[model samples]
Target: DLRLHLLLNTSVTCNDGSPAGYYLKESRGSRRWLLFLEGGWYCFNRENCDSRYDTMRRLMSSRDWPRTRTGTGILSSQPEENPYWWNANMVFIPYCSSDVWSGASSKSEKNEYAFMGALIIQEVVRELLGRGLSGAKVLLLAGSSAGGTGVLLNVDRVAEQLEKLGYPAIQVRGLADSGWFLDNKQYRTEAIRRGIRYWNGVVPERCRRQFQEGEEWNCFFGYKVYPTLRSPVFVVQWLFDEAQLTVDNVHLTPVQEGLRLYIQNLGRELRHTLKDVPASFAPACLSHEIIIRSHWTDVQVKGTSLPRALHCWDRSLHPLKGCPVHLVDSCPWPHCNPSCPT
Candidate 1:
C-alpha cells in the first residue's frame, strides 16, 4: 500500500543536536527504491548558521515536517501521478546539517552547530537497509540544490555500503538537480573556502590529495567531484541559474555587458564541468531547484522534455553518445522568458 511513514528513531542528528529523521513509503510489493535528499543552501558563517538554527530545520523536531503533507514527484502516493517509480519504495531525507550532507562532527563559536551531514547520510542508509533496502532490485538516489550536491558527495559511499551489505547485484543510479555549480575565479572560490573552513567538511581522499593542504576546498566544485564519481550521474540544471546570477550580481556589476559575459562564461564552465557526466538536461533559464518544483514538467530544453530526456539517457546503451545537447535559449538580452520567474 502507498503511504507515508516517518522513521524517527534512525538516530540521525542535525547541526543543532536536533533529532533527524526520514519519510518513507513502501510500494505495493515493489523491490525498487528511490531515496531523495531534500535541499537548502549550505550555511557556513555565524550569521547564516544562526539564522538557519531558528528555522524548522534545527530548532524544531523531525516530526514537524510531515504533519501537514506527504510525498510528491517520484515519491507520489498515486501511481498515475509519478508512474516512473510510483511502485518503488520512496524515502525522503531532510536537510538540517547545513553542510550539504558532506560534513563530519560539530563546531562551535558564539553559536553551537553540528556539521554531521556525512554521518547523517550513513546512519539513514543503514536504517534503510534494515527495512529491506538491501534487497532492492533497483535504487535511485536523488537530491535537489544542496541536497543534489549531497548525492554526488555520498553516492559512492552508499554504493559501497550496499555492496558490503550483500546487495552486490542491485542496480543503483543518481539524479542531481541544480547541483552542478561553477567554480569561477570570481566569487566561487571565496564562498567555497568559507564553507570548508566553517563546516569542517572532508573532501574525498582522492580528491583531497589532488589539491594543496588547505586547498581541499577546491574539491567542493562539481567539476572536481564529477570525475571521481563511480556511479552514473544524471544532472538537471539551468544554464543561467538565478542563484548564481544573484551571487554574480550581473546586473549591477560594472563590467562591460556584465550579464551577457556572465552567461557566456557560466555556460562554458558548466559544459566543461559536465563533460564527463553521462547525461544532463541543462536548460537556459533563471531558476533554481527543478526536480521538486513545477519546472520539472514546464521546463524543456531543445525538443526533449525533462522526464523523457532523463529516461532516454538512463536506458541508452551509449550514455554520452550525442548527449549533452548543449542547449541555450536564444532569447533577447534582458530576459530569457517573460513568463518565467525572475
Candidate 2:
C-alpha cells in the first residue's frame, strides 16, 4: 500500500540527451498535489561536468533511471507516516541537469552539456496540467538539499506560470528543506557565481531585479532572494548544517572553543535572517537534511514537530493566528536536542 506508482514518460529530456521523466502516484479524485524534485549537487564547468559524467553519470544522465521508486518521509502516501495531505497526487521529478534546478540554456554547438534545469521544471508542470494539475486546489512544491533550493528558485515562477495558464485559483506554496545556505565570509560564493555562467542559470525576475547587474548570483542564497519571493515558503534548516560546515571548511573532529562559538553564531545568524519569515522550522541540530529522513516525525522545535507545523499551515485558509509555523528553537548550540540523530 505504501509503494509509489509507475513511471511517467515525458517529452522533456535530461542533460545527456536521454529521455527525462518522473514517478507518479495518482490518489484518485484528489485535487491536492505535491510535486517533489530530487536533489544532487551540480558541476560548475565543462571540466567538472566531464568528471561528473565519468564519476557520477546518473546525476547527469537518465539512461538507467529506476523503473520504480517508493515514497518516504514527506513523500510518503501512508496516512500514519504522513498525516496531512497523503491523499494528494504526488509526482517525483528526478535531478539530472546538475545545475541546482536553475539552468535554462540548452546544449550549444561548442558546449557539450545541456543546461536546462529550469526548462525541465517548466515542462514537467506543463505536462502535469494535462494530467489534472490545471484544476489542482493546492500545489505544495517541496524538496530536500539542492532540490529544496530549486523550490526557492522556482516556486514563484511556477505560481506565475499557473496563473497565466488560467489556474489562478490554485494555491502554490513551497517547502524547502535544508536548502537555506548563509552567505558569509566563511563561505565562498565563487563556485555559485561560476555555475551561473557555466549553466546559463535563470534567476527569478523579481529577485534578479533587486540585485545589481553583476550580482544576480545573490539569488542563489535564501536570505538574499527571500525578500522578493511572492509565494509563501516554509523553510527547514538545521542550526549547524553539516553541508554548510563542509563548504566553510569547519571540521567537527576537533571540538575547540572557537568551533563551539562558530556553531552558536550560525544559529544566531539563522534566527536573525528568519525573524520576519512566518513559516520556518530551525532546530538546534548538526544534521544536514530532514523531511526525507525516517525519523522526521521525531524532530521538533518548541514541542511542535514538522508534520504538525505543516498540517497547521495547511488548515489555515483564513487569517493566520496561533498557527505554529515558526518553530524556532530558542536554545542554542548544535545537537542540543536529545532527539537529534547521534
Candidate 3:
C-alpha cells in the first residue's frame, strides 16, 4: 500500500533535497507513500534586497515579497527526486518553480506553475489508479503563504483532473497556511480600480507591468479553474503576516467583501444542481494578523503532544492549528456540511 505526499510549495524550497522532515514524517499508519512535490515562489534570486523571508514576517500592505532565496525561500534541490513515476504503485510528480503571480490581472508566466502543478498531480493519480492503489487513502496537500495558496487553487484542479481521468470521487484534504486565493478576476479588476481611486489615480506600475510581462498567464489559474475542482479546502492565515498583499491588501471593494461572497455564490450555484462541485473556502482567522507583526499566536497540533504554543521560525509552526476564526462552520446555504480545520 502506497501513500501519496502531494506537496504544494509556498515560498519554501528544500535546496538540500529532503522531505520537509515534518508533515511527511507525521505518519498516517505506517504506509509507504508516493511523493508529489509542488514548488512556489521565493525560488528566484532577489540580488540582496534583504534577507529571504523569515518565519516571523510582518504583515505588509502590498506584496512585499522576500528579498532573497534564503531564510525560508522556495527553491528545492535535485536530491529530493524519486523514480516512482515509473513504478506502478509509486509516482513522484514535483511542482516546478514558476511565479504564476507575476502575470497579474492577465494570465501570465506566473500561472505556468499552476498548470504544471495541476497536470503533474493528474498524472500521479493516473499512475496510481492504473497500478491499483485505493482504499481509505489520504490525498493531503500542504503549503505556507504563496505556496499555500497554490494548494488552495490547485486542489480544485487536482479534483477536476480526477474527474477527467474517470475517477471523479477522489477528494483532497487541503492544509494551507497564510494562503491567498488570487484567482478571482472580478475581485482583481476591482482591486486595481480601487487602487486608482484610493491613490488618486496612482495605481502602481508593478500591477500593470506584471500584466504586461506575464500577459494573461497569471489569470489562467484564477479565471479558469472551476470545472475540475471538487475537493474540501482548509486554510490558515496569520493576522500579522506583513507579506499579506495581492488579495489581502487590494483596495478593491469586491475583494474586501471576502470569501463569504464566494460562499454565497457557491450556494446559488449548488441550487442549480451541479455535481461534484468542490466545497472550497478558507477560514477567517486566516485574515491578516496586523498586530503581532512577527510570528504567530495560539498554534496547536491536532493529535500530538507537541507544544501548542510553538514559537516563530520552528518547523512545528508549519501545519497550523488555526484560531477560533477557523472554527466557524461553513454556511449550510449550499446544504454543505463543511468541515472545519482539524
Candidate 4:
C-alpha cells in the first residue's frame, strides 16, 4: 500500500528551512526495503539560491511532494512489472537542500536559506526505523542523477546506521543512475569547491588529506570516490551525457567538429574510471536519465535492455559474474542524434 507520512516534529528541514518528510509504500510480499533519494542539481551561493526561491525545488512542501505511480521503472509495485524489486518496502526522499543530500549543517549566507542535508537523511532514517524498517531483510539504496551520487556517498553510512539499529542480517546494496559525472578536464573543480564550502559539506577527512589545499574538490569526483566506497554499487550512465554536455561545457560553438570527439573521450574516461565497478551499463545514447519507461525498453546496448541488465546484476555477488560491464559500440563523431534531450 502506498502512503505519504509527514514527520511533523522532526528536526529535518529542506533548503528553505521547512519541515521534511517522505513517501512510504509498504510491500505485500517481503520485509525488504528500498530508499530512493530524489535528484535535483544543486545551487551553491546566495544568487543561485535566490533564483530558485520560487521554483518547485524550494517552494513545494514535502507533504505535497509528487506521488509515484506503479510501473514506474524500478519503482513498479507488481512482481510481473518489476521482477527484481516488486513488493519491497520503498521510501522516496525528496531533494530540496540543493546539496545532493550531503550538506553538513544549516546556515544563512547573507540572509539566504540553507540547511543540513546530511542531518535530514539521518532524521528520516531514524524515523523509518521506528516505523518497522528495523525488520527489513534486504535494503536497496538507489537514486537517479544527483540523487544517484547522494546514495553512493551515503550508502555505507546508511548501512552502518541500520546495523547499529539491530538489523545486522539486512543486505544493503546501491545503484547510481546517471551520476557518473566526468571530471570534465577539471573544468568543474572550482565550482565543486565553492559548492562544498557554501553548503558547509563535510568532505571525508581521509580524502581531504590526500589532495592539495586547493584541490579538495577532487574527492568529490566519481572516479576518486567509487574506489573507496564500501557498499556494492551498480552504475548506469549514458556514454554521451547530454546533460553533462550542456552543464560542463557552456561555451561550445556550433561549428566545432571536435565536440563529438571530446564527448567520446569523456565517455571513455568515465567507463575507464569505473572499470572496477561491479556492474554498469554505458549506453551509446545521447540522453541523460534512463530510468523512465520509454528508455527502459527502447534503449539497448548490445541487444540487452537496461532493466534486464540490472535484473541480472541484482542476482549475483561478484561484479563480473553478476553483470559483466556492458559498453555499447561508439557513435561516429558529428553523427549523433541532435534531437537528444538538453
**Pick by TM-score: which candidate is best?**
2
Worst 10 residues of 3 by lDDT: 304-313
* Position 294, candidate 3: lDDT: 24
Q: Could you tell me which 10 consecutive residues in candidate 2 have the lowest summed lDDT?
A: 1-10
Model 1 lDDT tens row, 249-306 = 5544344665556677776666566555657777656677877553355556666566
Please identify model 4 stretches exceeding 4 Å from their true place.
57-71, 79-81, 107-111, 186-188, 204-209, 212-215, 250-256, 292-295, 318-342
- Give the per-residue lDDT digits (tens) of candidate 2, residues 171-277: 99999998899887573288989998888898899888888677878998998887799888999888888888888888777667777777778789988888887
Alpha-carbon RMSD to native, per candidate: 3.9, 2.3, 14.6, 3.6
Candidate 3 per-residue lDDT, tens place, 17-66, comes to 12111112222342233333333433222221113223312211112222
Each model's total of backbone clashes: 1, 0, 29, 0
Model 1 — which ten-residue stretch has the worst lDDT? Answer: 325-334
lDDT of each: 0.68, 0.82, 0.32, 0.68
> Which scores higher on lDDT, 1 or 3?
1
- Model 4 lDDT tens row, 1-342: 446665664556777667777778776567878887778777778788777766665332454465543435567676555655767787877777788767866545553565566666667778887776777777778888887778777777777877897778877778888877876662336677888878877544455667757676776666677776677788887776666777766344463556656766776676577566657777665666766343355555666666777767666653454454454435543225332333
Best by lDDT: 2
Error of 3 at 105 (Å): 19
Candidate 1 C-alpha error for residue 166, in Å: 2.5
lDDT of 2: 0.82
How well does model 4 score by local distance difference test? Answer: 0.68
Clashes, model 4: 0
